[PDB]
Design a protein around this ligand. Structure first.
Ligand SMILES: CCCCCCCCCCCCCCCCCC(=O)OC[C@H](COP(=O)([O-])OCC(O)COP(=O)([O-])OC[C@@H](COC(=O)CCCCCCCCCCCCCCCCC)OC(=O)CCCCCCCCCCCCCCCCC)OC(=O)CCCCCCCCCCCCCCCCC
Ligand SMILES: COC1=C(OC)C(=O)C(C/C=C(\C)CC/C=C(\C)CC/C=C(\C)CC/C=C(/C)CC/C=C(\C)CC/C=C(\C)CC/C=C(\C)CC/C=C(/C)CCC=C(C)C)=C(C)C1=O
Ligand SMILES: CCCCCCCCCCCCCCCCCC(=O)OC[C@H](COP(=O)(O)OCCN)OC(=O)CCCCCCCCCCCCCCCCC
Ligand SMILES: CCCCCCCCCCCCCCCCCC(=O)OC[C@H](COP(=O)(O)OCCN)OC(=O)CCCCCCCCCCCCCCCCC
Ligand SMILES: CCCCCCCCCCCCCCCCCC(=O)OC[C@H](COP(=O)(O)OCCN)OC(=O)CCCCCCCCCCCCCCCCC
Lengths: 67, 317, 155, 96, 112, 96, 103, 91, 79, 344
């Protein structure tokens, strides 16, 4: 019947979720489990950069009250 | 990593792009009382790969045509389509272009060059007419297409597609602004030269002006482009107007929901094609410079006043 | 690559060179499109976004699009190769001139407010609506008249 | 709903803008302190680069006024690592 | 010449904590330590030069460090939970974390 | 800096163009536009590195006026290849 | 100007934004704002013929805040000769050029 | 740069495909009415460009002014369009 | 009126089109909220509020902004 | 023209010069120039005759490139001084560009080729506007910047114009082009004194306007674009023969009439400034202008050319009258000389 148009769709869907799940986990892996900071405006880039300088070289590492 | 994130977001879309043609040649089929392609492979799954290989193997005829432009137009087409998928705001978008919607609008406009140049390069009368007709309709639908977005943005606060995920945390922008959704949907149908608005390659009226002389590999690249676009524009409808649910804890839900709505609205233009005859050239443009453009202009004002008199100006984050 | 800016400027110059050679009106339109692209790039390079976009959605958009349309209608008849040759001739001469000063990206983003919250291109041009309210009234009158000028000149 | 949501969203926006309003004083000091260091550090190398050059005031305001003219980006990072300069110059246009 | 101040003149203890840490405590720091900062601002504005307010800047920093030492000593755990959740978010938005914020805010009201 | 000299010479190369017709009115109307782009780019560039935001209105006013200017120019062009079947300038020699 | 219908009518549609030191949006001062003031409060009441000789200190400075060419020059020299010192292996960037630092 | 990286892969992927295509298989109009529409496009595009800045103007303290200014822009151009109709120019 | 009627039934876009044009030209003028827009946007603290010299006779916010004196946005709150 | 369009255009052709004059921000001065360019082109092609399209397409290209050059000068200044307006400090080349450009829009000297040709293909009416309400705008921009422009160039463009205008006029027989040529010449005198005493430029213009406006409404009263056509003036309308005679000799510098004052005071001001080289050569070829003016005098008044029988028919019918402006501008022009001291 119409049962059969589903096979094809399944392979479309599966190929349209990969991208959204992929981009959203290759970010939380590269950024240390914390969402990649979105620096829309400079202030944010400043804060981000400030973070880099604060520790290691990468901003994702985040020092706390114990420092 | 970033490279891997380029394979994903590309291949996956290309593989899905292939499966759309199949779900087009079966959904149109069952609507017309026919199984559609099921004999090659299981349930026709290998069917998209099969003609791709035939198309590339068949001779790329070079008519006795400006070669450079003739060959470039296809390249531009695909380049643009794949590019327009870069800033889409599925969760954690590949690239947070701060002015993304503008970027989308920009690249979308550049595509017109392909059809125009293709027709001019083809050097065939049919192609020439196709280009002229195409450029006109394309650009015109761009004029309402852009204004419809400007109305949206003013209620979103920014050009970044990522903001709408925070704008649509309580209600879809269809409820408000539904009148434009319809007008975004019809314009999305024109800009992908799909059926109700497909005078670019009417085939019956004029025979595929865009690719009259294009065959094999060039045919395929635009071809691929059109279908990827078919998805992209539907996906933009599924972010701007139908806002999928989103949860910071679980970012996947968005993608999954984004999938479902994109597939259904992608299914809709497939369903539109089989269901409607094709608008005439004059009729098409009238609808936009006459039936819609006045509608789109006025609501723009209403959407300018709305925030103010409702003191509903959006945050600029 | 500090040279990035100079590189871009050169490309722009070269594109305008082609337009200068006056190739087929369509070739000219194409060349300008390339230059306009280079242009938005340079503006963005300085930091201006909205500004860069404009040329794109205006020049790389219809500005040449209509030209294109137009040409199709009034330009029918296709030495471009010779023109291409002179173009290379100019390129080297252009390069030669820079090589002249050669024998004889250091400072861009000359000054910036590292911390800032409401600075960005477009904000200034957004002041067309407030404290520059005579630019946009005169531009609006320009368009509203231009409608009439074109409708009679075509009439 | 849109009217109420954006009014709420506006309240959140004023809250975090004020959060930096409070924190910028700590940063302003930090910036200046570091800025001067870059200028001075460049002075050291400056006092070691053109020493041989005749008629070479180690350094002198290109201007006449003694007013404090802030340091261009180039001045701060010009002598420094190329990457350092590039980062500052093309480091925002290129997102995180 | 340029009369650029010397390094020893501009060396002072540094806060150096992740920006996130600050944003979470931003509100309170804007509260417990604006006396000196405002004064420093006044100097830095009317007196355009930075050299003319360097010492004030040192005072500016000193005021915050202890601000932190107090919190480290009291209600450190709450604050630690609040910043960690605040940092995970990409724009470090305040509303994603309100449950952690409440416990951090209530405690320091209770102790500090 | 030099960036400006390239743009300025671009405008002069576009100047040499408009002043030396080559039998195509359209091409000229296209060269003319090459200037407006060069002017728009230069105005935007200096406004941007002078941080003079009060002047950004101009970079666009320049384009808005230039667009209509071109609209008029093309309508004359269409008028000419309606009266002479070509845009070729030689045809425009009746006023001798 | 030629016909001052603006001063007469009191309107100021064209004067508020003629120089860099004029009101900037959101009170974000533009670059060089430190000099143009000093170079136009000087030349106010003194006509041009005498805004061109005695008020030359403020333009020679404002001609350098903006163009900022003497700086370019000085620096370029520093660069070239530093190249020569490195040439004689006399000099190489210290960790000062590359090192960790305060927030 | 990140964008540059993505885009060049994008062109490369296309150019690769066209090449494969060619290398593998070795074995006068009178659109006067249109012209007019095209010009209007140019014009309308420019207006839109003057309407693009709104997203930031909505923030202007001088909200009222922005309203008046904006409302005028749309209205005036709307009139232009209507004229086209009134004069039957487009038809 | 009669044409209006047919217009509502023939060419029923323009009618709607104009209607909106007007309704947007009216609601702003009459609205218990119109005033807020210029305030809500005015208030957003984009730029730092530079302090003032406490010379004397100052009714301004007394030092710590937590002090009662000063402007308030309770109007924004509970809006 | 749908009377609405007529209004929009005419308003622009009139808002065009007025914005230029009123504003100080040069940019706003440029768009004033731009609006004049856009408004004039529709009227130029009103007959839409094949000659007309040629006229407008030339006028437009000449006007457009000059407009772009003027903008480049403003754009360059913006970098050499943050100001949007020329100042004492302005680089000399920056100002010279503005002189050349503005001398193209006004059509002076070696850029005098477009004007005679556009004056030939446009109606007599639009001829006046193209000659006199379109010179006010650019001149305003120059007069404002006079302290800064070069005395050498202006003089060269001044002298050249005088010569070109005179020489060109001698051969021409088409009236529209005789006037175009005269305007080039008078425009020359005007730009000669700009560096020294701008106030006299504004006199040598008004008088030119008060002289040319009556002269053209005379040419069109009988709509004669030929001297042969104006020569039969004696039959078509005899009275205007007297004043047409004096106005044309007034346009040239002959002493009893108002036309001498502009040349006389310009010469007095140039000698006061010591250009007794330049002033002398200008006055001398200025005398060439009167020769072609008097040759027309001969044909129209002092000698009666033969006419056509069909003319008796045009006499019968009542002649639509010349507007009042003709008189008030003919007399104030032919004889105000006794009142010169106040004029200057
Ligand atoms: C350096 C200076 C040189 C000056 C001379 C040279 C320059 C001028 C040359 C003029 C001619 C050039 C050649 C033209 C073509 C000639 C051939 C031709 O085709 O003519 C046909 C043409 C046919 O016209 P028409 O249908 O017979 O017209 C009848 C006339 O209007 C006649 O009508 P009417 O006679 O039946 O009516 C009587 C009326 C006639 O009215 C007019 O015609 C007036 C014309 C004024 C022209 C002004 C020109 C300057 O009398 C009056 O003028 C008014 C008198 C009462 C009022 C008095 C007011 C107070 C006066 C006080 C004294 C004024 C002088 C001293 C100043 C005050 C004390 C300090 O012949 C003319 O009419 C010529 C009219 C102009 C004559 C100007 C004489 C000026 C003498 C000086
Ligand atoms: C009514 O009959 C018709 C149809 O079938 C029902 C159509 O769907 C269509 C639509 C288009 C077609 C002629 C057939 C659809 C085409 C295909 C099967 C795929 C086209 C192939 C390509 C351009 C590339 C395919 C390969 C890839 C995507 C490889 C990617 C890695 C039309 C116009 C038609 O005539
Ligand atoms: C082929 C033509 C089409 C190519 C694909 C479409 C390209 C469209 C580019 C739009 C302009 C880029 C843009 O809008 O965003 C770039 C982004 C800066 O934007 P923003 O969000 O402000 O980021 C700063 C704060 N994080 O970050 C950047 O600035 C990245 C650097 C600029 C990249 C611009 C696009 C590069 C395109 C490279 C291929 C060009 C091919 C040209 C072919 C013609 C012949 C030369
Ligand atoms: C083609 C398109 C053509 C368009 C032509 C537009 C011509 C005018 C353009 C600028 C209009 C400026 C209007 C300013 C109105 C204003 O500032 O409002 C304040 C005051 C009273 O208004 P208010 O009490 O706020 O009532 C509004 C209720 N919603 O209003 C007043 O009392 C007057 C305020 C004057 C503000 C200074 C205006 C100086 C000149 C501005 C440019 C216009 C010059 C003339 C044209
Ligand atoms: C008060 C505050 C302000 C708000 C005011 C709101 C007032 C109420 C809303 C009024 C407008 C609602 C409709 C908006 C879209 C339609 C606009 C329109 O006027 O239609 C034009 C045209 C029909 O025109 P025609 O039949 O030719 O006759 C014209 C008579 N003037 O339309 C067409 O012909 C379209 C042809 C389409 C062919 C394909 C159809 C596909 C149908 C299925 C998909 C529909 C869209 C799905 C969208 C999903 C979400 C995006």
């Amino acid at each position: 019947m119409w049962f059969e148009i589903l096979p094809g769709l399944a392979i479309m869907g599966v190929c349209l979720v990969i991208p959204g799940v992929s981009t959203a986990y290759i970010h939380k892996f590269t950024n240390g489990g914390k969402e990649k900071r979105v620096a829309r405006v400079q202030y944010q880039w400043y804060l981000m950069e400030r973070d880099r300088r604060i520790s290691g070289v990468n901003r994702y590492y985040v020092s706390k009250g114990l420092e | 990593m970033f490279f891997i994130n380029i394979l994903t977001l590309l291949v996956p879309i290309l593989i899905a792009m292939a499966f759309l043609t199949l779900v087009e040649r079966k959904i149109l089929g069952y609507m017309q009382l026919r199984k559609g392609p099921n004999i090659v492979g299981p349930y026709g799954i290998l069917q998209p790969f099969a003609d791709a290989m035939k198309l590339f193997m068949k001779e790329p005829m070079r008519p006795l045509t400006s070669m450079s432009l003739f060959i470039i137009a296809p390249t531009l087409s695909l380049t643009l389509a794949l590019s327009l998928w870069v800033p889409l705001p599925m969760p954690h978008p590949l690239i947070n272009l701060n002015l993304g919607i503008l970027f989308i609008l920009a690249t979308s406009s550049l595509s017109v060059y392909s059809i125009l140049w293709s027709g001019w390069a083809s050097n065939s009368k049919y192609s020439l007419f196709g280009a002229l007709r195409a450029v006109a309709q394309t650009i015109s639908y761009e004029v309402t297409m852009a204004i419809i977005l400007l109305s949206v943005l003013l209620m979103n606060g920014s050009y970044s597609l990522q903001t709408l995920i925070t704008t649509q945390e309580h209600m879809w922008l269809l409820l408000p602004a539904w009148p434009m959704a319809m007008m975004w949907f019809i314009s999305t149908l024109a800009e992908t030269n799909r059926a109700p608005f497909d005078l670019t390659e009417g085939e019956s009226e004029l025979v595929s002006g865009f690719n009259v002389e294009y065959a094999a590999g060039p045919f395929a690249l635009f071809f691929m482009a059109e279908y990827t676009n078919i998805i992209l524009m539907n996906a933009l409808t599924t972010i701007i107007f139908l806002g999928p649910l989103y949860y910071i804890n679980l970012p996947e839900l968005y993608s999954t929901n984004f999938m479902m709505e994109a597939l259904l609205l992608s299914s809709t233009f497939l369903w539109i094609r089989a269901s409607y005859p094709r608008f005439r050239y004059d009729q098409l443009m009238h609808l936009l410079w006459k039936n819609f453009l006045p509608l789109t202009l006025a609501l723009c004002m209403w959407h300018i006043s709305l925030p103010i008199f409702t003191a509903g100006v959006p945050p600029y984050m | 690559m500090n040279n990035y800016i100079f590189v871009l400027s050169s490309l722009f110059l070269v594109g305008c060179l082609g337009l200068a050679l006056k190739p087929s009106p369509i070739y000219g339109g194409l060349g300008l499109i390339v230059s306009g692209f280079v242009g938005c790039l340079m503006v963005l390079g300085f930091g201006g976004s909205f500004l860069g976009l404009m040329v794109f959605l205006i020049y790389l958009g219809g500005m040449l699009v209509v030209f294109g349309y137009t040409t199709a209608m009034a330009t029918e008849e296709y030495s471009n190769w010779l023109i291409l040759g002179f173009l290379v001739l100019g390129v080297i001469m252009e390069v030669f001139l820079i090589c002249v000063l050669n024998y004889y990206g250091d400072w861009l983003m000359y000054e910036v407010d590292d911390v800032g919250v409401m600075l960005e291109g477009g904000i200034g041009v957004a002041a067309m609506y407030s404290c520059a309210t005579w630019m946009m009234v005169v531009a609006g009158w320009s368009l509203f008249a231009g409608i009439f000028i074109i409708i009679e000149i075509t009439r | 709903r849109m009217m109420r949501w954006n009014q709420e969203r506006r309240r959140l926006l004023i809250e975090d803008l004020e959060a930096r309003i409070a924190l910028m004083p700590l940063f302003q000091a930090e910036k200046d302190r570091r800025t001067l260091q870059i200028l001075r550090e460049n002075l050291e190398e400056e006092a070691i680069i053109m020493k041989d050059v005749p008629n070479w005031k180690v350094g002198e305001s290109v201007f006449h006024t003694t007013r404090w003219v802030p340091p261009l980006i180039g001045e701060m990072y010009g002598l420094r690592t190329k990457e350092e300069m590039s980062n500052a110059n093309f480091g925002f246009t290129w997102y995180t | 010449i340029v009369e650029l101040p010397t390094l020893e003149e501009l060396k002072v203890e540094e806060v150096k904590v992740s920006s996130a840490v600050l944003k979470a405590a931003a509100h309170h720091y804007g509260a417990q330590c604006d006396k000196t900062n405002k004064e420093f601002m006044l100097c830095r504005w009317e007196e355009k030069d930075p050299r003319r307010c360097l010492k004030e800047g040192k005072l500016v920093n000193g005021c915050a460090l202890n601000f932190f030492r107090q919190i480290k000593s009291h209600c450190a755990e709450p604050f630690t939970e609040y910043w960690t959740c605040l940092d995970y978010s990409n724009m470090q938005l305040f509303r994603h974390c309100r449950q952690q914020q409440a416990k951090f805010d209530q405690c320091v009201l209770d102790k500090l | 800096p030099s960036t400006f000299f390239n743009l300025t010479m671009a405008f002069s190369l576009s100047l040499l163009g408009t002043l030396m017709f080559r039998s195509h009115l359209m091409s000229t109307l296209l060269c003319l536009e090459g200037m407006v782009l060069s002017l728009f780019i230069m105005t935007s560039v200096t406004s941007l590195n002078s941080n003079s935001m009060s002047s950004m209105p101009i970079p666009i006013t320049i384009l808005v006026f230039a667009a209509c200017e071109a609209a008029v120019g093309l309508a004359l062009l269409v008028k000419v290849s309606n009266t002479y079947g070509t845009d070729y300038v030689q045809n425009l020699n009746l006023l001798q | 100007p030629f016909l001052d219908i603006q001063k007469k009518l009191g309107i100021s549609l064209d004067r508020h934004f003629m120089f860099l030191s004029a009101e900037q949006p959101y009170k974000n001062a533009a670059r060089c704002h430190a000099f143009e003031k000093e170079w136009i409060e000087c030349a106010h009441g003194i006509g041009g013929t005498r805004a061109k000789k005695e008020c030359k200190i403020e333009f020679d400075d404002f001609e350098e805040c903006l163009l900022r060419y003497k700086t370019m020059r000085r620096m370029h020299d520093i660069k070239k000769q530093r190249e020569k010192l490195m040439k004689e292996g006399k000099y190489t960037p210290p960790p000062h050029h590359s090192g960790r630092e305060e927030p | 740069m990140n964008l540059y990286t993505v885009i060049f892969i994008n062109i490369l992927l296309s150019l690769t495909l066209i090449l494969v295509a060619f290398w593998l298989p070795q074995m006068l109009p009178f659109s006067m009415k249109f012209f007019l529409v095209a010009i209007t496009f140019l014009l309308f595009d420019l207006e839109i460009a003057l309407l693009l800045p709104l997203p930031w103007a909505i923030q202007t303290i001088k909200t009222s002014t922005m309203m008046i200014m904006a409302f005028i822009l749309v209205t005036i151009l709307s009139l232009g369009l209507a004229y086209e109709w009134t004069q039957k120019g487009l038809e | 009126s009669a044409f209006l009627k047919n217009a509502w039934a023939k060419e029923p876009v323009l009618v709607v089109s104009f209607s909106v044009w007007g309704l947007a030209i009216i609601m702003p003028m009459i609205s218990p909220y119109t005033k807020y827009a210029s305030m809500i946007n005015k208030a957003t603290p984009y730029n730092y509020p530079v302090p003032v010299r406490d010379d004397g006779n100052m009714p301004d916010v007394p030092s710590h902004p937590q002090d009662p004196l000063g402007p308030s946005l309770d109007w924004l709150k509970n809006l | 023209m749908n009377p609405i369009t007529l209004a929009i255009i005419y308003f622009t052709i009139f808002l065009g010069p007025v914005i230029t004059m009123s504003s100080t921000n040069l940019m706003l001065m440029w768009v004033g120039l731009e609006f004049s360019l856009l408004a004039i082109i529709p009227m130029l092609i009103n007959k839409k005759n094949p000659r007309s399209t040629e006229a407008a397409t030339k006028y437009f290209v000449t006007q457009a490139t000059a407009s772009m050059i003027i903008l480049l000068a403003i754009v360059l200044n913006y970098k050499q001084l943050g100001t949007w307006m020329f100042q004492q400090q302005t680089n000399g080349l920056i100002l010279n560009m503005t002189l050349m450009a503005l001398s193209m829009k006004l059509g002076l000297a070696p850029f005098h080729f477009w004007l005679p040709e556009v004056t030939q293909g446009i109606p007599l009416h639009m001829g006046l506007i193209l000659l006199t309400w379109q010179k006010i705008a650019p001149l305003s921009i120059l007069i404002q910047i006079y302290p800064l422009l070069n005395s050498t160039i202006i003089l060269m463009l001044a002298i050249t114009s005088i010569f070109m205008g005179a020489w060109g006029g001698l051969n021409q027989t088409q009236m529209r082009k005789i006037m175009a040529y005269s305007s080039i010449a008078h425009m020359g005198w005007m730009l000669a004194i700009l560096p020294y005493n701008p106030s006299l430029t504004l006199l040598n213009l008004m008088i030119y306007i008060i002289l040319t406006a009556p002269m053209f409404m005379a040419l069109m009263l009988n709509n004669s674009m030929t001297i042969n056509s104006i020569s039969l003036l004696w039959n078509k309308t005899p009275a205007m023969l007297t004043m047409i005679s004096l106005m044309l000799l007034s346009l040239g510098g002959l002493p009893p009439l108002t036309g001498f004052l502009p040349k006389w005071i310009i010469i007095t001001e140039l000698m006061k400034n010591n250009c007794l080289i330049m002033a002398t050569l200008m006055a001398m070829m200025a005398l060439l202008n009167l020769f072609f003016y008097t040759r027309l005098i001969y044909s129209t008044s002092l000698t009666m050319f033969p006419t056509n029988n069909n003319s008796k028919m045009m006499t019968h019918q009542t002649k639509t009258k010349p507007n009042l402006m003709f008189s008030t501008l003919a007399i104030m022009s032919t004889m105000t000389l006794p009142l010169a001291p106040q004029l200057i």
